[PDB]
Amino acid sequence: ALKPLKTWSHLAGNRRRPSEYEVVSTNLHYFTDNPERPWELDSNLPMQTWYKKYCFDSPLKHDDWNAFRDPDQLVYRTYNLLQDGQESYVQGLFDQLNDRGHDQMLTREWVETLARFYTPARYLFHALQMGSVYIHQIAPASTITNCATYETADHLRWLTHTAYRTRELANCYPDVGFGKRERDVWENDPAWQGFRELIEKALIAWDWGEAFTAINLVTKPAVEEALLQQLGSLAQSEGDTLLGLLAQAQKRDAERHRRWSSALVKMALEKEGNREVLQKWVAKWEPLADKAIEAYCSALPDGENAIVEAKSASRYVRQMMG
Amino acid sequence: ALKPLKTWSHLAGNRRRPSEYEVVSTNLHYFTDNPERPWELDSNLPMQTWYKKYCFDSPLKHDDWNAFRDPDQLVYRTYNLLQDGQESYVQGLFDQLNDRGHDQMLTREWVETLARFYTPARYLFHALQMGSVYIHQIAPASTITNCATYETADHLRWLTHTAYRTRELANCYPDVGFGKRERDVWENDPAWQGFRELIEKALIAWDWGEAFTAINLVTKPAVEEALLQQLGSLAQSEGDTLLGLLAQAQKRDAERHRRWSSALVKMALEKEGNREVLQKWVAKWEPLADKAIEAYCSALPDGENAIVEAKSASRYVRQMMG
Amino acid sequence: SMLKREDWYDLTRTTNWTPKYVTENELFPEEMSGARGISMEAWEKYDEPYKITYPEYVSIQREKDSGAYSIKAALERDGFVDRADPGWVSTMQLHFGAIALEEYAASTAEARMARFAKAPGNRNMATFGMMDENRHGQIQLYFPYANVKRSRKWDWAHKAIHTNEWAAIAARSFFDDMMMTRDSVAVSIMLTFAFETGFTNMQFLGLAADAAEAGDHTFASLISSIQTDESRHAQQGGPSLKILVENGKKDEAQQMVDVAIWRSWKLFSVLTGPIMDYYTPLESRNQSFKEFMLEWIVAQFERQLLDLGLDKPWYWDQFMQDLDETHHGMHLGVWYWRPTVWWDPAAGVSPEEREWLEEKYPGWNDTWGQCWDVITDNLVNGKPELTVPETLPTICNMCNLPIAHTPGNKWNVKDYQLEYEGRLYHFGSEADRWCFQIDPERYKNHTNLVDRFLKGEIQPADLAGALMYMSLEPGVMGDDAHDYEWVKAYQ
Amino acid sequence: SMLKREDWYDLTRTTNWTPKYVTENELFPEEMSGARGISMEAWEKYDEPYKITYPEYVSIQREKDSGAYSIKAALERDGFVDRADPGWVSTMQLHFGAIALEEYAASTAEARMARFAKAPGNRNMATFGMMDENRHGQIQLYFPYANVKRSRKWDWAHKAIHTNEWAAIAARSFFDDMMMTRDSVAVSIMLTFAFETGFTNMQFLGLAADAAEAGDHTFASLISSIQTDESRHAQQGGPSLKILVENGKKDEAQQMVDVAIWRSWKLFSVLTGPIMDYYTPLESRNQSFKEFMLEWIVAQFERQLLDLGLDKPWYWDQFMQDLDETHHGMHLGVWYWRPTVWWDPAAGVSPEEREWLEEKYPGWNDTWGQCWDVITDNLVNGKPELTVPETLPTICNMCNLPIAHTPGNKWNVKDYQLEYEGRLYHFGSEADRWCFQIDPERYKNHTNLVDRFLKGEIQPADLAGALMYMSLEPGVMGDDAHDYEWVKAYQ
Amino acid sequence: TFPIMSNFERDFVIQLVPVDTEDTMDQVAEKCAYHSINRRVHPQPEKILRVRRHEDGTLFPRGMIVSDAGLRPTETLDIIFMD
Amino acid sequence: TFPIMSNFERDFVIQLVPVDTEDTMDQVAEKCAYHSINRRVHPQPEKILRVRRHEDGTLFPRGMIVSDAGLRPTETLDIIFMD
Numbered sequence A, B: 001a002l003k004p005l006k007t008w009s010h011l012a013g014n015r016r017r018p019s020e021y022e023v024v025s026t027n028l029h030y031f032t033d034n035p036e037r038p039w040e041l042d043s044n045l046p047m048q049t050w051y052k053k054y055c056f057d058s059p060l061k062h063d064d065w066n067a068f069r070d071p072d073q074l075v076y077r078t079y080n081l082l083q084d085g086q087e088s089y090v091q092g093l094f095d096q097l098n099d100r101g102h103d104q105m106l107t108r109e110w111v112e113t114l115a116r117f118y119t120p121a122r123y124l125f126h127a128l129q130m131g132s133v134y135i136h137q138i139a140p141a142s143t144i145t146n147c148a149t150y151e152t153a154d155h156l157r158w159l160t161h162t163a164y165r166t167r168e169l170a171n172c173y174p175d176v177g178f179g180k181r182e183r184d185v186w187e188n189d190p191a192w193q194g195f196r197e198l199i200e201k202a203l204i205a206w207d208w209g210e211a212f213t214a215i216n217l218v219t220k221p222a223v224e225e226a227l228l229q230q231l232g233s234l235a236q237s238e239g240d241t242l243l244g245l246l247a248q249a250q251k252r253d254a255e256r257h258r259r260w261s262s263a264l265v266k267m268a269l270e271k272e273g274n275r276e277v278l279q280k281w282v283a284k285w286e287p288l289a290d291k292a293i294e295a296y297c298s299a300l301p302d303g304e305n306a307i308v309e310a311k312s313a314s315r316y317v318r319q320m321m322g
Numbered sequence C, D: 001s002m003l004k005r006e007d008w009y010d011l012t013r014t015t016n017w018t019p020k021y022v023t024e025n026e027l028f029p030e031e032m033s034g035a036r037g038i039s040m041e042a043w044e045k046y047d048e049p050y051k052i053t054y055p056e057y058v059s060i061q062r063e064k065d066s067g068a069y070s071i072k073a074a075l076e077r078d079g080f081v082d083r084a085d086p087g088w089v090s091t092m093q094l095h096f097g098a099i100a101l102e103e104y105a106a107s108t109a110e111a112r113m114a115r116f117a118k119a120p121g122n123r124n125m126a127t128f129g130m131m132d133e134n135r136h137g138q139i140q141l142y143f144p145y146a147n148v149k150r151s152r153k154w155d156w157a158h159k160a161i162h163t164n165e166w167a168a169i170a171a172r173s174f175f176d177d178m179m180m181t182r183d184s185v186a187v188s189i190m191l192t193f194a195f196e197t198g199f200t201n202m203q204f205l206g207l208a209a210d211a212a213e214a215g216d217h218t219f220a221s222l223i224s225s226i227q228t229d230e231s232r233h234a235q236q237g238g239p240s241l242k243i244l245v246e247n248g249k250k251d252e253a254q255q256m257v258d259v260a261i262w263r264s265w266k267l268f269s270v271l272t273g274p275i276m277d278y279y280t281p282l283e284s285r286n287q288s289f290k291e292f293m294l295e296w297i298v299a300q301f302e303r304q305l306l307d308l309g310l311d312k313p314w315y316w317d318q319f320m321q322d323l324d325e326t327h328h329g330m331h332l333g334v335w336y337w338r339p340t341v342w343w344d345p346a347a348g349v350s351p352e353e354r355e356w357l358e359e360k361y362p363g364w365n366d367t368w369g370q371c372w373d374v375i376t377d378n379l380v381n382g383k384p385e386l387t388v389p390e391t392l393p394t395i396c397n398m399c400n401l402p403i404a405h406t407p408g409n410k411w412n413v414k415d416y417q418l419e420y421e422g423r424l425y426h427f428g429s430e431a432d433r434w435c436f437q438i439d440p441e442r443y444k445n446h447t448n449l450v451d452r453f454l455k456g457e458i459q460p461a462d463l464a465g466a467l468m469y470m471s472l473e474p475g476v477m478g479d480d481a482h483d484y485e486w487v488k489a490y491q
Numbered sequence E, F: 001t002f003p004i005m006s007n008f009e010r011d012f013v014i015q016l017v018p019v020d021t022e023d024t025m026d027q028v029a030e031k032c033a034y035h036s037i038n039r040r041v042h043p044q045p046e047k048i049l050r051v052r053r054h055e056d057g058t059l060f061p062r063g064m065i066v067s068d069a070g071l072r073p074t075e076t077l078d079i080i081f082m083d
């Protein structure tokens, strides 16, 4: 008879006793058990073909993607603990700054900058939410999928902050069109057309490794540097302490996403040929990210400097990954 | 045989089913069962005399002080839920503003104002902690005692914020004497002598009703208006966004203390003669509170206006209670 | 001050825009989105009845796990599992093996809708659904993990869906068809409306009650916590169905609901039916599986369908009839083929249980009871070897379950065979065959365990070879839960 | 970034200053502060070993209550209390009645130190202590409240300490002397060092284990949660004692520790001893009360005292001896006078229990067993009326407990009487009388229940009048826990 | 060697039963009976086991051999008690 | 009417027993016995119950009356088996 083990059979012989993270996160996708027929149905269905083409046939290769480990080791339980603390902070800021009358003290000129450069970000953050939830469903290992799960939740969190503040702004300045105008700004304003082109194209990159590169390695650092870093700094200097703080709070999530993205690239570099595969995708997407930063930041106050700093900070993210 | 009840015998016949607040808070002091011998020992011990003189013989009178109910209905469980949310907020501010480099951006002149007018408040807040924990132990009803319990914890919370920030300031500006000089400032600076005289005298007012009036009705609104309201406003205008926010966060506790203080005065006014008893104590203590506000606020920037506003805001607290 | 949710909630789902740099069909590929020629504008009519925002979510769900993990830690050294009724132990082993990794795969099915639904309210609710199934897959691993040192059968909480054991294949067959290989709108209908709203929402209420009744407060607290998450995401198919019906697609919608409810029923008849009528100790049986189905499932379906403008599936009357039969067959099949599962099936045919069965199902003793008579005589007469099989049952090519039905004095076992492109397929019911015929390219070249055996894929091609192919070895292979203790009543 | 606690912690207790507008003796009255001529500067040497700051406190304690209240809510409908061993039910009823309002009064004893201690680290730790006892008093009301509809005896969780029932008087006598009527420094020593560190910290560990063993996971989770709070505040007397010893006050310190440990012991001998040796079912008895005392209490005391530079109390050897005796008397007294308590005492003298008692206490059957022999014969022979009393026992004027000791073949019951200012006092031990003589003005004019009876204060002056004076009526008056089921073993 | 599916009278389940292309219907019923009679179905020795094609109800004579029956691999056959 | 405390031989507890100032020691022992013999102590009819002052061990003669014993109210008395 088979004797009881101390841990799951797939973790037996790990020396050190498995963490909660390993116990609940590892080796959970079963579609990868049978690469010739991922799903338990006829092998020629559109979804079987989708997964063979975009998961199994990706040029980004590893023989054991299940070995991947999130450096933050997030699980659902620890995600909600962490983010309930961070939301107590943000929701306190919202509550106490409204108290306060913070929005009433912003200048007319800044209020107009918010309508153009801040509130339309509900589209861009939702497009990131969609981007990362696509990575979720096509990644080849449950531990890679879970990083994308919690990142998706974060992008929804950013959308939600932006939705809330947009209402608070509309209440304070009902003549500006906060809440009503953002779609037309996102669709028609030159400042947003670099980003919108970038994210619309990135959203149809179906190969899991390309999706990861386009969204996490290229688009996100450009979005985060333009919209959190440069706009947040500008907010602070313009008297908008709420947005200055909000953007820094959101950047903590962005730093987390970069940490797992960096761990994954690290793992990919264990195999010959992967760096070149990643550098080629970076070289395809990088020029659209430039266009994005250029169009958005050039339109801000002290625009040219914003462009230069957004560009090197985002390139630096990839540089530090090799 | 005595049949089982739906609630505690002392609450039986309340129409509506008792709240958790009523179940765990009411009618818990047993020293009041035998006013001639409060404690289960010889009736002439110093503590028996202390309680007969300072609880039982107080001129502030009611036939059922156990009927008192905290308007916020706090119990230990709901206190810790509430304050863990508020501390997630304050601790986030501390964490994110340090990140940030907030303290590095304050002017030399403001830094000196902090050393004089902010950090020595660790003494004053601890003196309030002592004040309210004395009310705890001499109040005649457990529901009055519990309001003083949670208020004591709040004053400890304010001391703790001040201790933390004092260290952070000393780290940023090691030549100022943050952490080292506050005792000499509290003991010797004219700006603090109104407050120190007020609180040292108030700390020896042993009658429960006088202690309540001196600490909660007179001293606290003066402390809160000088140190949270006027200094916090000044902080904000001087670039110190942390202290501006910290003081507003602390004021939320102060507003809670005023809410239960107001409920208690309300209850006291049900009995003839109590208003006059309370107005006489207010008239004894009010001039020392004036001296306090005068000495502290006159020494601040735009000092004379601070005095006028601190004075009417604190008087207004008592006015709205009748 | 804070705004009221209702004042800003809509801005969270004002997220559709008109693509320019790519086309709409490129951004939302029809095989993934299933928008069915209904415009982006008409999908925006989607309005979920239960609303939740991120801050509320993380706060409520933090408290849920604080509670459930607290209960678990408090009760852990008590070792209840070691003194639990062995039919209860087997119920848990079955539950965890069948469900833990399918809960986790459901987060991918939610991710499908989150990316590909044209209804922005659906994309956000699916992001919360994706989170919820993440929770469910994780907590339903963390909980059984406590027991790994008690028995290798607890390893199957993780291992099962990675095997070719026949119940695992039957579970992947169901989930892969309902939720993993369908477009976003079909997933909203087949998974969230038909399966989650339709079956598991009430099933989990029942299961938590059974757990508490068994004295298992850890598992009762687990299941009851998971259950409170269900409606937040199970609500997503109702709105999709409304849009299909209001636009020109009521027949498409009817057909998806018909397929999904039938396949759900088949899974339920093997995973839940036997548990209620045979594994749960007699004195703990609140109602029969048939009674549970009529009170808590079937009526609710008719109500939902009526309100949506849909019809009762064509097979409804037959389905009602099968409540007297199907699960008795799935039980007898699982007990008879017990070494082929990873839990110990409870026979559940003592005199006392048999009179309970007779009341709940008049006719039982003279149909089902006949086979059980023979089995009981062999065990009484020292021929246990005739109570385990020496062949494979015929497996349905739709649901991947044995074709079984009323035996004994009202014998009514039928095979709804189909010859299609030169292959002969077998089906356990008229509805099963129909699910195939309405979409044969979805199932055509799939092979069940029997098909594989006959094709040469299981080697050695014998029963022992079949067990190894299914990853089963002594220590996990099932046997009678009560170690034949019930035989002593018959001598 | 955040600082490390250690970098700023001291500033939280840098809070002493030199008063100017009032004098130091006015601000810290000696009857309240107990600084004993030791300077403010020397009290500032006080350094608590376990440190905690407000933010940590609220966060950890929020999680504690989330857990404990979660366990309670999960297990509530299970109604365990209705099928619990009735000695277990009685253990809980006794626990709650004796302790809930004394926990709450302990927050006042903590408030005493918070206001009046000259050591600033003591004032802050006492503010956290004041909070902790607030929790304890509240949660130990919320929990039994669940049961009020089961029996009026559960009302006594709130009512008991408001009555003149003799065990209530004995509890207030103890708590009022140790913690409510002493200066801050004496409270730190008598309450936190001698009683909390010395007894309840380990008692609660034991009690939570017993609860779990009884199948009561709600009460096990309650008690185990409360227990984790204890050391945060129980630590406060150790530092006070160090300062008294290092300054000129070792004898004062020794005398407070001697009184406090003796009074604690007496309370423990009636509230805990009988529970372990007689109410807990035999097969659940891990060790004897004497064994528990030697392993977990007595050794730890000697260790603490040695490390502090103090001596074993003068009565230590006698105390060791009394571990064989005192609680057997308190049990027999409580069972014999059972209508005078609000729980049902468990006799605990079956043949099987009596052989357990004989092993744990050689000599039991021929001393204690003698009285129990007579009782058992009367119950066997239909004379139950001779198993309840028709008079009051003599009550000790220190501990307010019956004067009782070894009966039967080694009869050794003694009264350590004292005539003082024209009144004759009675004492159950040499130590009890000594606690009186070292401080007679603290106890002189107190009257125990017997004193009151004899003075005319209990009217009608008969047993029925005494019951009414004690607020006891049928429905709460105690009787045998197992309804004399154990008598059937003797016929 | 030829796979059929046996639907045995009074049993509850259809089962896979390999038969030989040279078997008579009588020898097929024997092979089937092995997996049902005394398992789950009581003997009926007053009766003769017959073979009919499940799909259309066609009765095969006792002596007819599998080779001549026109069966599809895996065809379902009822095995019924007759006289 | 006079309160004493009875410490009865072989009992485990001292008890309050009202006696009369006119009682003999014999009648005091009777009054005490009522609360101990057949309660908790077995009879000893080969023996005579005597009264001694607990504090100093002074034996009172059987016929001596309470009035003459020089007792403090509530005095503890041992009630012992003798011959």
Ligand SMILES: [Fe+3]
Pocket (backbone or CB within 6 Å): C103, C106, C132, C133, C136
């Ligand atoms: Fe789920």
Ligand SMILES: [Fe+3]
Pocket (backbone or CB within 6 Å): C106, C133, C196, C230, C233
């Ligand atoms: Fe679900």
Ligand SMILES: [Fe+3]
Pocket (backbone or CB within 6 Å): D103, D106, D132, D133, D136
């Ligand atoms: Fe406590």
Ligand SMILES: [Fe+3]
Pocket (backbone or CB within 6 Å): D106, D133, D196, D230, D233
């Ligand atoms: Fe304590």
